[PDB]
Amino acid sequence: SNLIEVFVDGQSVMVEPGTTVLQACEKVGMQIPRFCYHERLSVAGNCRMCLVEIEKAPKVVAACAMPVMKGWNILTNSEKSKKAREGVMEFLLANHPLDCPICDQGGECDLQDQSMMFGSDRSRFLEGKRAVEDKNIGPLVKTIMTRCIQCTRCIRFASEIAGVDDLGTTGRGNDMQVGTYIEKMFMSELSGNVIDICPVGALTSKPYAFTARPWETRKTESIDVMDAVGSNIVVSTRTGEVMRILPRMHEDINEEWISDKTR
Amino acid sequence: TTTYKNLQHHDYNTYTFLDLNLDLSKFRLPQPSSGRESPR
Amino acid sequence: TSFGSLKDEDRIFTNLYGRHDWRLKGALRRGDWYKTKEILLKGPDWILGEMKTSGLRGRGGAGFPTGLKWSFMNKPSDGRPKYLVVNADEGEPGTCKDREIMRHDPHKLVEGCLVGGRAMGARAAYIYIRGEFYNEASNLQVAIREAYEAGLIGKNACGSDYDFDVFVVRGAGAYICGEETALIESIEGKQGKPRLKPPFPADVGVFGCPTTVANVETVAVSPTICRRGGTWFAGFGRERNSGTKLFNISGHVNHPCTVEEEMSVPLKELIEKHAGGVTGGWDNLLAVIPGGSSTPLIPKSVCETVLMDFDALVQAQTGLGTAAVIVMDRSTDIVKAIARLIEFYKHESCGQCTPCREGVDWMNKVMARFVKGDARPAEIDSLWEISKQIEGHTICALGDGAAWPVQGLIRHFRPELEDRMQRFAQQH
Amino acid sequence: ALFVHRDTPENNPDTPFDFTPENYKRIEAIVKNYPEGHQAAAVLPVLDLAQRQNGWLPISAMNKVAEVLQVPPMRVYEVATFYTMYNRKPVGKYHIQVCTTTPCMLRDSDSILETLQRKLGIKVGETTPDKLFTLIEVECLGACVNAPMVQINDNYYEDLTPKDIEEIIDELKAGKVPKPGPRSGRFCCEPAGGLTSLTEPPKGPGFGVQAG
Amino acid sequence: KVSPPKRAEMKTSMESLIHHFKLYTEGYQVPPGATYTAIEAPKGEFGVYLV
Amino acid sequence: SGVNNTKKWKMEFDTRERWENPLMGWASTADPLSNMVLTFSAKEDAIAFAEKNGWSYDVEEKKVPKPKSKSYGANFSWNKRTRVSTK
């Protein structure tokens, strides 16, 4: 009935066709890493971090893109798929500026953790980094692009959810650098969600620049007002005050993301 | 014959190429369509 | 067999060296558009029957068995049209072979779009050609105009019911855009960024339609292999590797050339029969490179015993790319050479993948630190080790092709680096 | 220069750019070259055609192309930035770009360039005060066999020596484009010691047909 | 990831700065288990029943 | 994108007055039963625990996201409208 026997370390998960390898491994409870992949954005292999050895093929495969075929066994904790992650994070953490006690996404970093969980401990990098020329996108979004990792999770947002087509990638190699070729102001509704969607703290919130740090907070789940959608929210507090207004995932309401007025 | 016989490409110019694409917009047959005027 | 002569009757690249009038009326004398009317009508499955039985493998840097590749779209009615694309982007440092096939015999390259076109089943073909190759392309459209004006293309292809056109897309100066998919995305008017490979180009490709990205050679030989052979072409070369090849020779050699001997010949001959011996003799010939750039060294410990197959050079820990031989000599800076090969890829990586934005530029900074000798030796067993972090961890085979030159430099020429770690270390 | 814009008076989106009348009649053949949809596939040639009308594509041409094709303007900036054959600073008139990969460097394509900076007096990327020349250290150009190389905006001088430029650039400054092609005797890329491969009157039509 | 790096190793390198920023904020995520380390302090069997 | 801080059934309580200390600026309180997380593994085990201790529950059910058909190739369509740009 349009199902595929798929294996995950010997499990017997049945999945519909057109499913990705992640979706085959989320039904078990295995969260393969990711920077390029957002569940609600188009697919592009740019991080190359979700790799898995696919049981008696020689070459690891980008799990975000691959449709699982038939009877394959994913080995997510192999001796190979860990060399395929300890060697990627080596690179993401090579030209990267050690601005963690500046980076507003300190504890909210999907790149500190994955390094601290699946990456290595030491740098064999001793050469010299690069620095990128920062933009002035506006009074909401605060670009520090020395630390962008080119995951294209911000152009696939401004072209498929907002309908803008502005934040292109300009160049090749390391000299490639996300953002407008010119001085333009990405001032739209749903412009504050590039903050929440950039896992790196390259572009973050300018008002909530340095008022807090995420472990400091207390998070209470409430609702939006001020538009009649009744969108769901996580109001985060710091000792009897308000510091952010984040979204909750709820499927009927917005989908996962909120406007700029209510944050 | 021991003489190179492709010397005519010496006296070419910037518009040599595209002027022939223009002349080759008459011999051609009409191209398909996605229905859309563009992917927007 | 100690083959390698290839009497000039069997040359499938006549006019290559310039003479005998590349134009029509000069390619008609050499045999082109001769029986192409019934090449088509006899069947698409018949043509591939004379590509499979010929053993015509790839001719780019991959070497895939053709016939199987074009049969990936011999489909029934999908609904979309079907296109063909042709990597005239030469690219690598050594691959002038297509700078001499576009002019000096364009009509052969226009055939295979039309012969191979019905073979896979198509509506038209896009000859993506390099941005700097201008005069090359003008020779094409002057040859493609003559093809339309002769009744050979357009609504009655050589007097038949097969409608077809040949379009010439023009690049803008890149090497990655010759890849199987950046090609396809560059034609679509975007960044030349390759694709991942569950959407194979034979199922969704250029303009969302299925394709067969061929090499210039792989189509230029299609017309005059199916009228003139299919088993003839098999007898030359070995069993899996059967054919000829536009060998291409350059660097520290008296007469660097383009020649097409019979494929799989001993490499000793290609610098002695043709392109007379390297400048100085045989104390020299240090560091031959059989492929263009994306293939590791072969240090003259093997070079006399070499057999230029695809699969024989595997045993030499190398591979045949586009058959663009580079040859160094004993009086060089071998690190300075390969340091530029990585500089060639730092200026050229599209910047998409993670271990190619900053794996190639990571190694540029290291090999550059080996030229001066301002590294130490314990990086060398790492600089290797990073090179295998890139191989299967990239979309296109550049990360393969950007580590393989480096693995060829450590596998043999380790102590020459160690020598320079010391010379620097002699300072203080 | 830097993959980013700084809206100078001469590089602002109010400069005079507008295609010639015949060029508008030429952009249409480029869009009939690609299907009804996907007319945004013409961003590569059309954006050269702007560069051919005038070199050094200004910001006003990187937008106008979008206006002619209805593409977003940003998708045009991603192209020119990605490619090297497109220019985005002002240049001279002849654009003398040199290969310096191995098999051209290996054959001393530094001497072709060291004997060029002295004949010119221009380091690499800057230009004459007369603004005719731009030396560029480019990577590879296809004709790697013909040992060193340059490229005067379109043409291929190759297999040449330091003494071979000195009649060339003297004929660029007050002369014509001096005979593109390899020096040293070989016509196109022959073995430069007499032919070795064909040497014979190539076979005629139908030679060896397998009974079709 | 269990013992933070040198105070100078976390100023050239990145990873050492990240693990420094996690060791001294969160910790290092021991696995679930339980032990009893009985140690002879001068009083005696000083014990710790971690869970 | 981390979803393992889910998978439990914490039993947080309402918040109350947090007055700023007149001396210092510190947020001070009187309700100690405010920083009061308690991790469970099932909903059937939580309401059985708060009914017991006299507390008044207010449940909010699980929110799992849908599974969503996501093809890398729909970005490269002839007919469709998902034909992406920027590769």
Ligand SMILES: Cc1cc2nc3c(=O)[nH]c(=O)nc-3n(C[C@H](O)[C@H](O)[C@H](O)COP(=O)(O)O)c2cc1C
């Ligand atoms: C980075 C990269 C660059 C490439 N550049 C070229 C090229 O410039 N010309 C070419 O013919 N092939 C190039 N290739 C190899 C193509 O994949 C190959 O030409 C094409 O698949 C033809 O396949 P075939 O051998 O079956 O004809 C390149 C591959 C990579 C990974």
Ligand code: SF4
């Ligand atoms: S994204 Fe920010 S917090 Fe994460 S590693 Fe980079 S600088 Fe540190």
Ligand code: SF4
């Ligand atoms: S700015 Fe953020 S979302 Fe955009 S490419 Fe860089 S890391 Fe990815």
Ligand code: SF4
């Ligand atoms: S390996 Fe390099 S050139 Fe190839 S797709 Fe990835 S980033 Fe681009």
Ligand code: FES
């Ligand atoms: S997370 Fe899968 S390729 Fe980026």
Ligand code: FES
């Ligand atoms: S290496 Fe110089 S033209 Fe190719």
